Amino acid sequence: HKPAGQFLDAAIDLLRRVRDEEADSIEAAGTLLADTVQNGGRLFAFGAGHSSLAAQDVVYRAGGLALMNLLTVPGVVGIDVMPATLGSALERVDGLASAVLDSSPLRAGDALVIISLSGRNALPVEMAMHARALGLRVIGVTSVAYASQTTSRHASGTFLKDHCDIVLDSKIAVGDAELTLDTVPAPFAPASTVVTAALMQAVTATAAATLADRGIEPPLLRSGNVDGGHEWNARVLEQYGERIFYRR
Template sequence: MKYLDTVIGSLKYVDTQKEKFEEAISIIENSLRSNGLIYIFGTGHSHMLAEEIFYRAGGLAAVYPVLIDELMLHRKASISSELERVEGYIGEVLDGYDLSSFDVFIVISNSGINAVPVEAALYAKSKGCKVIAITSLNHSKNSKPRNSKNLHLYEIADTFLDNGAPKGDATIDVGGKKMGPISTITGAFILNSLIIGTAEKLEKEGVELPIFLSANVENGDEINAKILVNYKKRVPIL
């Protein structure tokens, strides 16, 4: 299948960014060592990646996704696309989160050009957070920013990882139209690689991280319940 070949090729490309992975892992490692949280945010389909590493088997407890109904798809999908271009919106929302210089803020945006992800990254930096971006360099570098600051997301972040997606995300030509988006697959790979890499480094230092188990395996409920006791106050949506 063409799509399978495309997926494999894209994942292999993403895996070549060794230096970027190390930079991002180091940022997350330093945050967790200081008892910080990993905030993660995306609009539209990118919000799925914010949920990818939240409260799931093999996931870290210190993950706090910023999930805003109006910027997701289940309320009114087309409105979410309009809203992510509105300047001045996201700052008021993020005022409700207790961001600090100990935290990491991950922003996911395939195009990296719209006002909301750009302003979210700038807001997080204003609070002292280190910012990691997951974006498509191909799309960003071939698109004019849709924000008055004239910035792409990757230009703001302390480090970024290229998800390998083409401009427009879809990869397979079907009758002259493109199908088969790739950013969700490569984005999930990037995020899980960062979480695993961080855990491996801290494990070598003797730091034991709280990691959720599947609720459908032996002792899963009991182990997760102990983790929740310690994290529900810090991550209220748990």
Template sequence: MSYTAEYLRKCQGLIETVATQEANILRAAEMFSKSILVGRMVHVFGSGHSRIMVEEMWPRYGSFPGFNPIVELSLTFHNLVVGANGQRQAMFLENVSGLAAQILRNFDLNELDTALVISSSGCNVVPIEMAEIFQSKGIKTVGIISKLHSEASTSKKQDGKKLQDFCDIVLDSGAPVGDAMIYVDGLETPVSPGSTVGSCMLINSIKAELANLLTQAGHPPKVLTAGAVIGAEKATEIFQAAYDEHAHRISKMYQKVGIESYVSKQS
């Protein structure tokens, strides 16, 4: 069997793992729909390469408003690798206690909001504290982890708790311990991770179920759609409308944030 065939076979296993979670995927979609239908947002966060899942949810083709993508560049800016803004700093910062509170201090969180936090290990401090803060504010939270990898890993949070300890729903990407899925002859350590594949399937399954729920509720989402599908003029119209809706939603996250001022008191 070629390594390509073996990787694809492993991905088939990820599909099977995701398929077993259909009930929880629907529960997550129902949870998110309640926030979106009342004009609030689903906060989405991931550090490191989990940022990929944040951007997979919104904004991209086939996605729609209702999500607040929290992408902290200090935790996700990987392309320089070394030097200023390098990977070492990002890996250090994602385990600094208190950073999550500083990030969320920017938003006027509300118990009508919901949240999605992604961390393959579920063991880094910032995503764990994100979920912990959401829980403390009565915000229902979904977590995406690799169950096998998380169970084999040690939390970097002082009390030993992991992301799943602060989530109402936990979804499993199906990735193995260590994430990488392929052992190459003569190479000691495995290559070709699986968590991105499994997590993206979870993200888009939630998205599909959620789009159905919003449509059935009489508020079909404004889906970012390619001009090749609906024509350039219609695509542009939808993009502008979707971005404007996002602006209307996100404005609520800043309107009454933090310390009250005469501006925040104005209707």
């Protein structure tokens, strides 16, 4: 078959694995987010580089929770950095994650989602360890297969998944590459953003439904271009503005 359809089939199969193998962990994570909102805590999401894309996909998003904030490490917010190679170097800088966390409004009881495919670099591992040391609840979105087939690059020798309250397995095989061509020597075509974005949307949707089930109107963001959307968004900001950090 053609490369487009092989790649799309590989992404579909990964989404089936997530659906069929992570349904309980997704509900657990959604429940944790719901518990955090109900108990008055704050919600944050982080990833480095391309792992940042899934974190951004649930922040200030139509049909997403108004309460989800982005935790930003300058230089690794997407590949928005010059040179782009610096972003990869920053993932190995000990102390950066703690500088970001200590400066943030995150407190004990808050919930932080950490997206890291390999879970082996210093930044996301330190991110999780120090987050827990501050009393945060940590949800990891990580391919656990990496932990059994690679060595940690953190001084502790451990992986992201060793420091999460909840681990969501993003399934991607080591190498993040779904296609192989007889012509091409190296595998190519990564699906990890497809899968991590879908996984994150499932988690946040679950948290939103769980709050509804408890008789709590979920603070979802609405399109401005549907009547009442701006009225709705203003009420949510006024109700939850103290836990929303991307606007005032």
